[PDB]
Design a protein around this ligand. Sequence first.
Ligand code: NAD
Ligand code: NAD
Ligand code: CL
Ligand code: CL
Ligand code: CL
Lengths: 177, 177
Amino acid sequence: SRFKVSKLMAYILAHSPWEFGLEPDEEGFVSIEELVNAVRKVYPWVTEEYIREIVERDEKGRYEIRGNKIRARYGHSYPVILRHEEDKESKVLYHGTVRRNLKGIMREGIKPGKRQYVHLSINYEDAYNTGMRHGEDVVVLIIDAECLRNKGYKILKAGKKVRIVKHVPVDCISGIL
Amino acid sequence: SRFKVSKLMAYILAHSPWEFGLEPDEEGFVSIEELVNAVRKVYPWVTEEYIREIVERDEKGRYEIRGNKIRARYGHSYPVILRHEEDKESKVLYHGTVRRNLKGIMREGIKPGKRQYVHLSINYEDAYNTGMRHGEDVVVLIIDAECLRNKGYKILKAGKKVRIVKHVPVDCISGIL
Ligand SMILES: NC(=O)c1ccc[n+]([C@@H]2O[C@H](COP(=O)([O-])OP(=O)(O)OC[C@H]3O[C@@H](n4cnc5c(N)ncnc54)[C@H](O)[C@@H]3O)[C@@H](O)[C@H]2O)c1
Ligand SMILES: NC(=O)c1ccc[n+]([C@@H]2O[C@H](COP(=O)([O-])OP(=O)(O)OC[C@H]3O[C@@H](n4cnc5c(N)ncnc54)[C@H](O)[C@@H]3O)[C@@H](O)[C@H]2O)c1
Ligand SMILES: [Cl-]
Ligand SMILES: [Cl-]
Ligand SMILES: [Cl-]
């Protein structure tokens, strides 16, 4: 299925490319035919046209093709240089987490942890879906983006609905749902 | 949670699809995006990727995806046409029920009742758990599957653990757990 192939694409591109012999450039980009060969290791119906259709029909916009190079735009577990467009439009953003983290967040703000950035969503639905990775008892913080920027933070457009920012101080959290 | 959304998928696919606007075919298949859109009236965060993940991780293999369509494989409360492969490898199967039904079963054998088929399990554990739906005083009948096949019956692979047979005569009940 496209879903299964996409999961392997995320694994290869965002998490363990070297296991397959790929060498991401400093922005995550690999050659698409190396990627296609690696995916056929597992799913041999896959071709370059199939990879491209997945990229182009992705509602997240989580993949990016440039020439015959391809990457995950965001969410890697390894360091990448993220040179993304600034979001200046959004007034409200959302961060999904589990309730046990509120204690930390309300006194520390939202911190990027082991990533370069904190990940937000322009929709509460997406923030909830992502906050679910850490457990059942999901809460979604409402974030004041104009307040973020006025503190001097820049908000980048990592995906269609994903937004990233170095940090969210408590002052910028305007509700919990 | 995956629990609640799987329960809603079971309700929709196996019990009440019409109330959601879906129109199962003669085999119980609905379009996946129709299903996703139905589930999102209750759990608005649910995506098609989340539903495909549930199908994949279901330890029963109770859902089936065929192309862009999805069904419950067995266990509907409404009548559906069942074209599953024949199980020839299992030698013993299990039927979980409650003690009060023993008087009926030993008089008559195991009867499909409202369903097209009796539902058996590959696994003693799962037979027990399913039997608990009808009360707390559960007994699991050991069924001679080789006997059923020598008697004519065709046993089918409804699920990865579920097997279905039209009727189990008393002569085929090898014991009581
Ligand atoms: N969480 C969201 O709202 C959201 C939005 C869009 C995309 N995503 C995607 O999900 C993945 C990242 O998941 P994630 O956002 O859970 O990050 P993560 O998986 O790296 O986990 C970091 C966790 O730390 C928690 N945390 C942050 N500040 C804290 C503090 N001060 N004290 C205690 N805990 C704190 C966060 O809420 C989060 O649960 C990426 O692929 C990203 O693109 C998440
Ligand atoms: N019974 C099991 O061990 C078992 C195994 C695998 C899956 N399941 C699943 O459980 C769901 C319901 O299955 P079920 O088997 O509980 O059936 P069911 O819920 O449709 O109820 C039928 C009941 O009638 C009882 N019965 C059968 N013959 C009888 C007789 N002659 N006299 C009196 N009572 C009699 C059965 O033991 C059962 O308790 C289905 O989705 C099915 O796939 C059940
Ligand atoms: Cl990922
Ligand atoms: Cl505007
Ligand atoms: Cl059910």
